[PDB]
Each structure stands twice: as C-alpha cells, then as structure tokens.
Amino acid sequence: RILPFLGPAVIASIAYMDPGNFATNIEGGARYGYSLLWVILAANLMAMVIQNLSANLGIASGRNLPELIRERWPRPLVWFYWIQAELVAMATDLAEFLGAALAIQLLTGLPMFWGAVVTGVVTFWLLNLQKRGTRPLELAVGAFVLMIGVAYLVQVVLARPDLAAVGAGFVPRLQGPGSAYLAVWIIGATVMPHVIYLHSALTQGRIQTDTTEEKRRLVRLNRVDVIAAMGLAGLINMSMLAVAAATFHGKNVENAGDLTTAYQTLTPLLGPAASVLFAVALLASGLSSSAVGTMAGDVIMQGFMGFHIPLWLRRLITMLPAFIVILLGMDPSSVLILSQVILCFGVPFALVPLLLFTARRDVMGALVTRRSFTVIGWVIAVIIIALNGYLLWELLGG
C-alpha cells in the first residue's frame, strides 16, 4: 500500500552487494582507482531494470518466473531450469558462504572451518524467519543492508576520496587491458539469476488484488521500491570501489583482490576500525545473500517442480561446497572463477524467460511491459549475455 515491495526489492538488492561484489570492487579501486565507477553505475542501472521486470512479472501475472516457466514450457526444459538454477543458487551461495566465513576469521581468527560452521547455523536461522511469513526475513536483510551502507559511508569519509578523481572516474573510458577486463567483469557478473526468480516470487500475490487497475497501481509502487533498493546497492558498490581506490591505488598493494589481504592492508593505511567495519560489512553481506540465496533455491524448485525439500536440508547441501573448499584449501582463483562461470551461465536463462513473459498479454494482461521498454531490456540483456560469453570464453578457453 505505502511501500509494499521494498522488502522484496531489498531482498533482491543484497545479492548485488554480496561478498562477490566486495572482492571485485576492492580490486577495482585498488588497481585502477576510480576509473571504473561508471561501470558500477551502468551495471547497477541495468540490474535495476532487470529486477524491476521480475518484480513486475509477479505483480501483473500473480506467478513467479519459475512458475510461468513450469506451466508454459515443456518439462524437459523446466527440469533443466530447476537444475540450472539450483547450481546457480549453489555456486552463488558458495562465494557468499565463504565470504561470510572469511569475515568471521578476520574478526576472531578462527580457522575457516569453524567460521563456516558459524555461517551455517546462523544462515539457517535466517530462513526460519521464512518458514512463517516472509516480512521477518525482509527486515533481517533490511537491517543487514543498513549495516552494509553505514559501514561503507563511514569508510568513504575515512578514505577521504578525491571527488575530482571520483568524478573523473564517472567519465566512460578505460586505459588498456585489466582495467577493460575488470569493467567487463562488473558488467557481466552483476545480474544475479537466483534473485531474478525470487524477486517475482516475493511480489506474486503479495497484495491481493482482483482488478487490472489496482495492479498497475502496484507496478508504479514497486518501481520506486526497486530503484530505491537497487540504487542503494549501486552506491554501496561505488563506495567499496572508492574506498579501495582511496587507499590502495598507489600503495604497492598487490593481491588486493582477496579480502583477507585488503582487511590487513587497511589497518596500517586507514586504521583498525576501517578493517573491522569492512569485515562486519563483509560478514553481514555474506550472511544475508547466503540466506536469500537459500530462499531463492527454495522458490526455484517449488516453482519449477512443485515439491519442496526442508530448508535445513537445502541449507546443508549448499553448505557442503564451502566446507569442501575449506577442507581442501584452494585459492579463490579456482573458487571465485568456477562459481561465476555458473552465474554467467545462468544469467541468460534468467533474462530470456523474463523479457518474454513480461511481453505477453496472456501473462501480464493490460500490464504488458511497454514495447519501448521491452526493447531496452533486450539490449541490456544482449550486452550482458555477450560479455558473459566473453568471460565464459576467456576462462574455459577457445
């Protein structure tokens, strides 16, 4: 009624400031300063449009994106969509689980194993907020997102960034490879597929309506909510870029990508509090997006398949890759890479059904996405798919 879809929007935004974005934005600032801010902005406004379509999809149609895929498309393709999404929600949760567990290690020093054990029970409880209703989880991530922003505003004011150099960083341009490659990373690996499905689910039948006029009133309300929540995610990501830029650019800081070193190098540069507020930000970022990713996986199979496995069981499965990595002891290289391959793999599968169904009257009724805007969504999906193919190309090889 007032802000009906902020919750759904905030649950969707947290995936766009997950630990994955922390490492990317940190390395972005550390290596090339502010010269990539325009990429974070452009990437965020693109996702802002995407998540707005998924939200509108659930509002107008009263069915989440996996639901419409289940009833409209053959079950061979649906079963693959369930498996595809499950791997995407699982690969995504991995970088969020490990990032959360890493944050605990930075705060207490416990081995990554127990840090992951802490991440499990806590991330589990965050989904018993989901068993009954959903508002409680929406405040949970809301309060978490709130502690991600204040953590990086106070870091920005500490990093003392050169607004002239921050503004110059918003001019679309780059200088050679690496900078260009990392920009392609931000464009390609920003849209989170698992949240494209979930967002429509948190909006379906959220406000019971029985007309076509009352629905479009929700579409206009939801639009402000998505832009507000997604816009927030951008500024935060821009903050993570500027802080790293305002601290590591010309400081001989190498290997700044991984967070276990940025946390360390922050103490002698900014201060010990800059490191703590960075670790808690990472912690809150990992717990939330992991819990959201777990709820995403729940509505994913519920919508694609119908049947529903216990959340604790689902929590346990997605929790195994993390411990496998910890008990193994590999570098984020093979981890951060292999996982983002699956996300880049699942981006197209999330946007193609979204742009199509949102352009059908048998799904949307009189709330079909304006043709002029359906186009803008496809050109957005094309370059993201294109740049996902390039990334996917560059790692796999060819």
Numbering used by the authors: 39 to 436
Q: Mind quoting what the paper says about this structure?
A:
Natural resistance-associated macrophage proteins (Nramps) are APC-superfamily transition metal transporters that enable uptake of rare micronutrients such as Mn2+ in plants and bacteria and Fe2+ in animals. Metal uptake by Nramps is typically stimulated by acidic pH and accompanied by proton influx. Nramps have 11 or 12 TMs, the first ten forming a LeuT fold, as seen in structures of three bacterial Nramp homologs, including our model system Deinococcus radiodurans (Dra)Nramp.
We chose to pursue G223W—on TM6a one helical turn above the unwound metal-binding region—which like G45R eliminated Co2+ and Fe2+ metal transport. Importantly, a tryptophan modeled in the inward-open DraNramp Patch mutant structure at position 223 clashes with the top of TM10. We also determined a G223W apo structure, which lacks electron density attributable to metal substrate in the binding site but is otherwise similar to the metal-bound state (Cα RMSD = 1.08 Å); hence we used the metal-bound structure for all further analyses. The G223W ΔN34 apo dataset compiled from many small crystals is 96% complete to 4.5 Å, 92% complete to 3.4 Å, 77% complete to 3.0 Å, 66% complete to 2.85 Å, and 52% complete to 2.7 Å. Compared to the inward-open and inward-occluded structures, in the outward-open state TM1b, TM6a, and the top of TM10 are splayed open, and loop 1–2 is displaced by ~4 Å, to form a wide aqueous pathway to the metal-binding site. On the cytoplasmic side, TM4 and TM5 move significantly (by ~8 Å) straddling TM8 and approaching TM1a, while TM1a also approaches TM8 to fully shut the interior aqueous vestibule. As the transporter reaches the outward-open state seen in EcoNramp and our apo G223W structure, a protonation event at D56 may prime the binding site to receive another incoming metal ion.
